[PDB]
């Protein structure tokens, strides 16, 4: 029902309160209290993140480091600590990798896979790690707009165009470990097959006892092409 | 003078940035602003190569033109210049994407509401469109050859700051942010490199499939 | 933890009759079954609010 009833039964009397209320207050405050959560959850992991990177000790600005093709350490190292944090995220328990990743640069069209930018691959049981360069500094470097508009409808020298990057990072990394994850719990015909589709992340990705319960850091907005 | 050489270099920028780059940018854009970018176009002198090429498409849409490696430093220049975004990289990829989009935009006809096309269209290198297995299967055989760079074997415990100060000032500097802009910026930005990767490859895209089916996926399997 | 208190004294009580009768004929006026009723009402609401 749209709206809910009290009324007050008093011993020995007739007199009543019939007092109606409604749900919608109650819903609103719900919806408002619970963005507010989702929006600190989402607060807290990117402060995470930008602390761990700054314990990294390195002196240039991200961008900086990302257009630096002549070193390779230093994009390989980034890469490493945010695969790190969201296998942290993912499984809080355990932090490092059994293994040894071997992280190879790549900075021409042939290497470069058509959309995936971070391909994960392994080979005689040690896992590797390739990289898209000149992607991340296309994508890193498109001009974020920052004039405030909305469109929801339906000290420290950190600007909004380095914190949108930073959350972009985040997000190429984390479709990387997704399909990295779905390498583990399968076959490798099954990464192969899930490469071409992402429509396998419905296997077990649900509140489960292997997969816990996590924003993912994408759940956070549904969002969606508008094409016809 | 009888010209606003400031709003129609405004529009002019704009219009530049929202095809070329392909920033977050995305506004309605209207024949006002494209009349205006070609007749700040045609009245630069410098810009006069980056006319001559948007004229030649109202003929012919269907071909990259030839120049010189001349030519082609000089129109790098001239559009550097005009966006004074000199750390950008717009060699080649950039010239393309605007010549495809103007050939779209000047053979169009006159629309109510806008047309809304995705831009994969009028790839290069006259290549028969490719699969996504195939074109993958060829470039890990690249890729899976040789060469790493780092051997990191033991592993250590991802580490973090364990200062709290330097986490509240961080969370003080941030917060002003606000989180809808952020998540726009980045989920446009990885569609924008995605399709451009794409369509300099020269295969197939899923329009609303791939990419639409993703976000589903992470959707119902967060939810249900 | 806060406050201490460790021994625990009898609740004192007013036994003065006159100011007893006094504030008697003072609530005597209120009706006692609005009260009631806007006392349940407010706990209900607020445990609602909290709850939400």
Same mark, same amino acid.
């Given at each position: 029902?749209?709206?809910?009833?009290?009324?007050?039964?008093?011993?020995?009397?007739?007199?009543?309160?019939?007092?109606?209320?409604?749900?919608?207050?109650?819903?609103?405050?719900?919806?408002?209290? #619970?963005?507010?959560?989702?929006?600190?959850?989402?607060?807290?992991?990117?402060?995470?993140?930008?602390?761990?990177?700054?314990? #990294?000790?390195?002196?240039?600005?991200?961008?900086?480091?990302?257009?630096?093709?002549?070193?390779?350490?230093?994009?390989?190292?980034?890469?490493?600590?945010?695969?790190?944090?969201?296998?942290?995220?993912?499984?809080?328990?355990?932090?490092?990798?059994?293994?040894?990743?071997?992280?190879?640069?790549?900075?021409?069209?042939?290497?470069?896979?058509?959309?995936?930018?971070?391909?994960?691959?392994?080979?005689?049981?040690?896992?590797?790690?390739?990289?898209?360069?000149?992607?991340?500094?296309?994508?890193?470097?498109?001009?974020?707009?920052?004039?405030?508009?909305?469109?929801?409808?339906?000290?420290?020298?950190?600007?909004?165009?380095?914190?949108?990057?930073?959350?972009?990072? #985040? #997000?190429?990394?984390?479709?990387?470990?997704?399909?990295?994850?779905?390498?583990?719990?399968?076959?490798?015909?099954?990464?192969?097959?899930?490469?071409?589709?992402?429509?396998?992340?419905?296997?077990?990705?649900?509140?489960?006892?292997?997969?816990?319960?996590?924003?993912?850091?994408?759940?956070?907005?549904?969002?969606?092409?508008?094409?016809? | 003078?009888?010209?606003?050489?400031?709003?129609?270099?405004?529009?002019?920028?704009?219009?530049?940035?929202?095809?070329?780059?392909?920033?977050?940018?995305?506004?309605?854009?209207?024949?006002?602003?494209?009349?205006?970018?070609?007749?700040?176009?045609?009245?630069?002198?410098?810009?006069?190569?980056? $006319?001559?090429?948007?004229?030649?498409?109202?003929?012919?849409?269907?071909?990259? @033109?030839?120049?010189?490696?001349?030519?082609?430093?000089?129109?790098?220049?001239?559009?550097?210049?005009?966006?004074?975004?000199?750390?950008?990289?717009?060699?080649?990829?950039?010239?393309?994407?605007?010549?495809?989009?103007?050939?779209?935009? $000047?053979?169009? @006809?006159?629309?109510?509401?806008?047309?809304?096309?995705?831009?994969?269209?009028?790839?290069?290198?006259?290549?028969?469109?490719?699969?996504?297995?195939?074109?993958?299967?060829?470039?890990?055989?690249?890729?899976?050859?040789?060469?790493?760079?780092?051997?990191?074997?033991?592993?250590?415990?991802?580490?973090?700051?364990?200062?709290?100060? $330097?986490?509240?000032?961080?969370?003080?500097?941030?917060?002003?942010?606000?989180?809808?802009?952020?998540?726009?910026?980045?989920?446009?930005?990885?569609?924008?490199?995605?399709?451009?990767?794409?369509?300099?490859?020269?295969?197939?895209?899923?329009?609303?499939?791939?990419?639409?089916?993703?976000?589903?996926?992470?959707?119902?399997?967060?939810?249900?």
């Amino acid at each position: 029902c749209n709206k809910v009833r009290t009324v007050t039964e008093i011993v020995n009397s007739d007199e009543k309160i019939q007092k109606t209320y409604e749900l919608a207050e109650f819903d609103l405050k719900n919806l408002s209290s #619970l963005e507010s959560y989702e929006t600190l959850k989402i607060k807290l992991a990117l402060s995470k993140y930008m602390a761990m990177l700054s314990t #990294l000790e390195m002196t240039q600005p991200l961008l900086e480091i990302f257009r630096n093709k002549a070193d390779t350490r230093q994009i390989a190292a980034v890469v490493f600590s945010t695969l790190a944090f969201i296998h942290n995220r993912f499984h809080p328990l355990v932090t490092n990798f059994t293994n040894k990743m071997e992280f190879v640069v790549t900075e021409t069209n042939d290497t470069s896979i058509p959309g995936e930018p971070i391909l994960f691959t392994e080979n005689e049981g040690v896992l590797l790690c390739s990289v898209d360069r000149p992607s991340i500094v296309k994508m890193l470097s498109r001009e974020f707009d920052t004039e405030a508009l909305v469109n929801f409808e339906n000290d420290f020298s950190i600007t909004e165009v380095e914190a949108t990057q930073y959350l972009t990072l #985040l #997000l190429t990394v984390e479709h990387a470990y997704l399909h990295y994850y779905i390498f583990k719990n399968y076959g490798v015909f099954e990464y192969c097959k899930s490469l071409t589709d992402h429509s396998l992340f419905t296997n077990k990705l649900r509140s489960t006892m292997s997969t816990k319960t996590s924003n993912l850091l994408l759940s956070k907005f549904k969002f969606t092409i508008e094409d016809f | 003078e009888l010209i606003n050489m400031r709003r129609y270099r405004n529009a002019a920028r704009k219009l530049i940035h929202h095809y070329s780059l392909n920033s977050t940018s995305s506004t309605e854009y209207k024949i006002s602003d494209v009349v205006m970018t070609m007749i700040f176009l045609l009245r630069s002198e410098k810009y006069h190569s980056l $006319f001559k090429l948007l004229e030649t498409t109202f003929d012919d849409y269907t071909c990259r @033109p030839q120049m010189t490696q001349v030519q082609t430093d000089t129109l790098l220049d001239a559009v550097r210049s005009l966006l004074e975004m000199p750390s950008t990289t717009i060699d080649l990829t950039t010239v393309d994407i605007m010549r495809s989009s103007f050939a779209r935009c $000047f053979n169009s @006809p006159i629309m109510r509401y806008a047309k809304i096309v995705l831009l994969q269209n009028v790839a290069l290198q006259r290549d028969k469109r490719t699969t996504l297995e195939e074109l993958l299967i060829e470039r890990g055989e690249k890729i899976q050859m040789l060469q790493p760079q780092q051997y990191i074997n033991s592993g250590t415990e991802i580490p973090f700051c364990d200062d709290a100060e $330097f986490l509240n000032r961080l969370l003080k500097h941030i917060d002003p942010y606000p989180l809808s802009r952020m998540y726009y910026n980045a989920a446009n930005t990885m569609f924008y490199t995605t399709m451009e990767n794409y369509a300099v490859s020269n295969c197939k895209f899923n329009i609303e499939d791939y990419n639409n089916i993703f976000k589903v996926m992470e959707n119902i399997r967060k939810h249900s």
